[PDB]
Structure 1
């Protein structure tokens, strides 16, 4: 478990996403075994664990150490360091490494940075910190108030880890919509200008403001007063007809979403933040070829029901 995690992270930072999820699944299994793995045959009996993983287990439980962990490239720690810069992923980290960069100082002084990456670097430490749930509330209220200021009808909901009831939040995810099914259009320009006027927003990461069909705003904010840190803010404005699917998507968790969408896929359906669809056509590779039909989903419960699944409260989706 504690040993299988080091490998999982290494593969993740190296770009082997599926192997990484493979390890993550095994680790999760071991963390829920009525008893500690005492034998190879026992390890193989657990779903999500096979000979390969079992062997490594039978080694850690015996040899006390896993030879694998002692052979992990020395580049990993650096790749992880670089990958934690907002806007930089595995490809950029590997490129910087190949170019001989080994520290953030190297990046600051020698690396070519995108506009997003420079913001990520400037707030490096802050972006790795999680904020108290209470601060998330304060941030949501700052956005809601600015929104209801020019349209008291607007509906604002804090989603993500906040809605799932977590004690701390990585960022604050605010969903904005309007019950009148029309007053949501082009409200990003007004809201962002307002939030900027009060100095709440400090940096923009993703915001297609030239597009009137802008769907999301990814940025950075900071509440007033001393002792405040820069916090990440994710805002999406959606049409009321998509409210249920958008809320479901934005609430997550990410793992929960992928599992739910995977289920829908096994039923010839498809689920996005826009809608739940049926009669979806896919090829042998599993890729979509036909769009299908959009199903009516007034509430999140409707989505679960149409999928033949028992409704799950947000805190029940913390996967």
Structure 2
């Protein structure tokens, strides 16, 4: 029963096979064992108390409600703010393991200062229940990983990610968050072949690489207003989100 036990532990958020193997050696076999005796990060502690809820997929309708709960609270600061859900949701899946929401503003300035106030707003509402990786202040983008829950009876806690980008990077951001994961690797593995690089920030050309293929030059950023431009500059037929489910 070792293999089932490792799986049991691995389904905790913030716990992988290394920690599960450690917990197993300590003699833990149940979630209760982990809760009473094991040393936990705040993350792992949160994932342990939402273990059941976090295992469930959600109907995309509930995902929609979550996107609007974020969009409303966002536009309460600036009406011109854009909020797009880019998970399994954008790819059209009937179910979502989590909700991923991208946020930007067309003017390219008003996105600033929103991140902290938006999270604060959601917390007051009682929408955001716990924070995991409460922070990322990467470049011009910001990322939040957290736990939300819709108001009402019989509601499960859901995993919620929020990212905020400048409009100039909105295309590469949507691409990255929309996925899929295997699609992103494929696309970026390919750009690498063409002497280019792809990230959530920008598509770049003239990326220097050495004989080993290691990147030693960052190259230069190509302006990509929309997703379709990124596909074009990479010599690829544009794929709709539903065609990116690899």
Q: TM-score by structure 1 length?
A: 0.74
Q: Aligned equivalents of 1:286 and 1:253: distance in 2?
A: 25
CA shift for structure 1 position 202: 0.6
Residue-by-residue CA offset, 1:112-141 (whole Å, 9 max, x unaligned)? 000000000000011111100000000000
| Counterpart for residue 126 of structure 2 | 199
Could you say which residue in structure 1 is the equivalent of 2:66? 139
5+ unaligned residues in a row in structure 1: which ranges? 1-73
The DSSP-based 3-state class of the residue aligned with 1:233 is strand
Q: Deviations over 1:1-60 (max 9, x none)?
A: xxxxxxxxxxxxxxxxxxxxxxxxxxxxxxxxxxxxxxxxxxxxxxxxxxxxxxxxxxxx
Q: Deviations over 1:68-122 (max 9, x none)?
A: xxxxxx5322222111100111221122122222221111111000000000000
Contact 1:276–1:295 under 8 Å retained in 2: yes
- Please say which of residues 108-117 and 184-193 is displaced more in the overlay: 184-193
CA distance in 1, matches of 2:187, 2:213: 16
User: Are the equivalent residues in 1 in contact too, given 2:137–2:143 (CA < 8 A)?
Assistant: no
Q: 1:188·1:214 contact (CA, 8 Å) conserved in 2? A: no
Deviation at 1:282, TM superposition (A): 2.4
Report SS of the residue matched to 2:40. Answer: coil
Question: Which segment is superposed worse, 251-260 or 211-220?
Answer: 211-220
The structural deviation recorded for 1:207 is: 1.5
2:220 corresponding residue in structure 1: 293
For residues 279 and 117 of structure 1, what CA distance do their matches in structure 2 show? 42
Give the number of aligned pairs.
Answer: 246
TM superposition score normalised by structure 2: 0.96
- Give secondary structure in 2 for the equivalent of 1:290: coil
Please give the per-residue CA displacement for 1:219-257, whole angstroms capped at 9, x wherever unaligned.
Answer: 111111111111110100001100000001110000110
Tell me if the contact between 1:220 and 1:233 (Cα under 8 Å) persists in the aligned partners.
Answer: yes
1:269 and 1:280 in contact (8 A); partners too? yes
* Higher share of residues assigned helix: 1
SS at match of 1:220: strand
For structure 2, the 5+ residue unaligned runs are none
Distance in 1 of aligned mates of 2:209 and 2:4: 40
User: Alpha-carbon deviation of 1:212?
Assistant: 10
2: CA distance between counterparts of 1:111 and 1:168? 33
Does 1:266 pair with 2:216?
Answer: no
* Aligned-residue offset at 1:209: 8.0
Q: Per-residue deviation at 1:315?
A: 0.2
